[PDB]
Structures are given as C-alpha cells and as structure tokens.
Amino acid sequence: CQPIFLNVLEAIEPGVVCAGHDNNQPDSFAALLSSLNELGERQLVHVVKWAKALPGFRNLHVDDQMAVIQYSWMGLMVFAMGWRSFTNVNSRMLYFAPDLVFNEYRMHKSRMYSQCVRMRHLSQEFGWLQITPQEFLCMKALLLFSIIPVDGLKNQKFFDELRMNYIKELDRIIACKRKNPTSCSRRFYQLTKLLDSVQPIARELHQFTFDLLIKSHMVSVDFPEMMAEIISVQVPKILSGKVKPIYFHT
Amino acid sequence: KENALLRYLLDKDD
Ligand SMILES: C[C@]12CCC(=O)C[C@@H]1CC[C@@H]1[C@@H]2CC[C@]2(C)[C@@H](O)CC[C@@H]12
C-alpha cells in the first residue's frame, strides 16, 4: 500500500535553479527585474519538463498542454517560491533563487513592494497552517489545472477529469492519518482557501509584468524570448477577462 | 504551435 501518486510527485520535483544575478553590483531597478525575468525563463524550462511527467498530463490535447502552462506559470512559480522562503529563511525574506534573495530593501527597489508583501504573507501561511511537504506537492500540481479560458479548452472533458482526480488525491493526503471527520473537512477547507489566495497575487504580478513589458525599452529591462511572447499574447487574455482562474470558494 | 520555442520544449524528449 505505497503512495504511488505521492512517489511520483516527489520523484519529478525540480531541483535548484539560479538566476545568475550579481549581488556584487549595487541594487538597481533594472538589474533586479532583469534578473527576475531571466529566472522566469529558466524556471519555465523546468516547469515544462515537470509537467510532461505529471500523471495524465500527456492525455490532454497538445494545444491544451501549452495553454495550461502559458496561463498558470505565474501562480505555480509564486507558490513554489513561497515554500522555498518558508523552509529556507522561515518566511523572513523572499527566496526567489540562491543568488536572488529579496530583503525589505530589494522589495522596495523592485518597485513592487506591495506585491512582495502579499507573497511573504502567503509564505507565512505555510507555517501558520503547518503545511506538510506532501500537501505542498499536491497543491502545486493542482495549481497547473486552476486557470482556463471562458470559451473552454479544445478538449475540456479530459481536463475536467484530470483536475477532478488531482483534487481527489489531495483529499487522500488529508483523509489518511486522520480519524476525526470534522478535522478532515476543516483541513480541506483551509487548504482550498490557501490555493485560492494564490490567484489574486498572480493577477497583480500579471498586471505588473505586462506594464513593464510595454515600457521595457525605457527602463533598460530585458525580457527573454519565451517570456516576452507569453506576456504579450497570453497574459493579456487573462487581464481582459478571457481566461479566468478556477476558485473553490466565491 | 504559436510559441515555437515552448512548443519545441514540449515535444522534445529529455
Ligand atoms: C515568476 C518570478 C520568477 C520565479 C519565482 O521564483 C517567482 C517570481 C514572481 C515574480 C515574477 C518572476 C519572473 C519575472 C517577473 C514576471 C517580472 O517581470 C515581474 C514579476 C516577476
């Protein structure tokens, strides 16, 4: 009676990814943001390899596979970053990468202090709720299937079945090692609330990156190849209401 | 697909 599903998620979990930032140089808006964009491109490559290895993922239509990756990367990366911050610096700072750790001073220099405050808060939730490594892994996987277009995907049916199974697994991690049914229901309630709080944060970051892309030539900020294309084509659909997140609560 | 690079990353074996 081994955790086949959990074994897989643990086995495919990406490793450490550096941004290539030079902490030796004085912090400047352009340098910090250029480093974040580069980190995004690097983690994006890792999110693709991780996703392809997820149970059932290759069952979706190829066009849908690219759609969920293009729409949910922000949320996925913010959630993982929140976990890294918690486990590494106990949510004291934002652990984007080993060579890119944000303190209060960098949060201000990046011109996105408010958004950083919410990310730090999410990170603190991992501690306040005592989120376990297993629960973390399952929630992150579910985040890949939490945002889609209102007009539906090419094969909406396969997607619905896939998302339904992942919610079921999360239920399994909570159900097991817990006799009291009231505590199970309470736990599911708390975790679904946690997952929903990720969406508002991702939207604010979407708006911010989109605006920066438009005026990137003025602030001397560079956007990688894939990043610039996703933000100019996919992100706008999110901001115009064409693509929306799936919330458990209202 | 549209995002040529991304599309390549998906169908490429690693
Ligand atoms: C996803 C990244 C990079 C990977 C990560 O750890 C989370 C973090 C959240 C803020 C993003 C950043 C990538 C580059 C962005 C999109 C900047 O343009 C503005 C917001 C930044």
Buried b (16+ CB within 10 A) or exposed e, A2-24: eeebbeebeebeeeeeebebeee
d(CA A10, CA A55): 12
Dihedral sign, Cα of residue A98, residue A10, residue A168, residue A158:
positive
Is the CB of B8 inside 8 Å of chain A's CB atoms?
no
Technique employed here was: X-ray
**In DSSP terms, which residues pair with A100 in a beta bridge?**
A97
Backbone phi and psi for residue A176, each to the nearest 5 degrees, phi listed first: -65, 150
Residue B12's region, left for phi above 0, alpha for psi from -120 to 50, else beta, is beta
Q: How far is A226 from chain B (nearest CA, A)?
A: 7
Facing residue for A226 by CB, picked from B3, B11, B14: B3
Dihedral sign, Cα of residue A212, residue A214, residue A220, residue A224:
positive
Dihedral sign, Cα of residue A169, residue A173, residue A178, residue A184:
negative
- Resolution in angstroms comes to 2.1
Contact A100, A35 (CB under 8 A): yes
Name A93's Cβ contacts closer than 8 Å, sequence gap at least 6: A85, A101, A102, A103, A120
Tell me the count of A-B CB pairs closer than 8 A: 33
SS3 content of chain B, % helix, strand, coil (to 5): 55, 0, 45
CA distances to A3, A46, A86 from A163, in Å: 19, 21, 27
d(CA A94, CA A88): 10
Taking CA atoms only, the protein residue closest to ligand 1 atom 4 is: A40
Residues with CB under 6 A from ligand 1: A 33, 36-37, 39-40, 43, 74, 77-78, 81, 96, 205, 208-209, 212
Residue A246's region, left for phi above 0, alpha for psi from -120 to 50, else beta, is beta
Look up tokens 């293009």; give the residue.
A70
Residue A224 in tokens: 């990688």
Name A41's Cβ contacts closer than 8 Å, sequence gap at least 6: A224, A225, A226, A227
d(CA A51, CA A13): 10
CB contact under 8 A, B14 and A65: no
Ligand 1 centre from A209 Cα, in Å? Answer: 8
Mark out the alpha helices in chain A (DSSP H runs).
4-12, 29-52, 62-89, 104-109, 113-128, 133-143, 156-175, 181-196, 198-214, 216-219, 225-239
Taking contacts as CB-CB distances below 8 angstroms, the residues of chain B near A226 are 3, 5-6
Is the CB of B12 inside 8 Å of chain A's CB atoms?
no
d(CA A82, CA A60): 28
Contact A194, A169 (CB under 8 A): no
Ligand 1 centre from A206 Cα, in Å? Answer: 9
Dihedral sign, Cα of residue A8, residue A133, residue A69, residue A157:
positive
Burial of A211 (0-12, 13-18, 19+ CB in 10 A): exposed
Query: What value, to the nearest 5°, has the Cα angle with vertex A45 and ends B4 and A170?
Result: 115
Residues after which chain A is broken (C–N above 2.5 A) are none
Domains recognised in chain A with CATH numbers: 1-250 (1.10.565.10)
CB contact under 8 A, B3 and A48: no
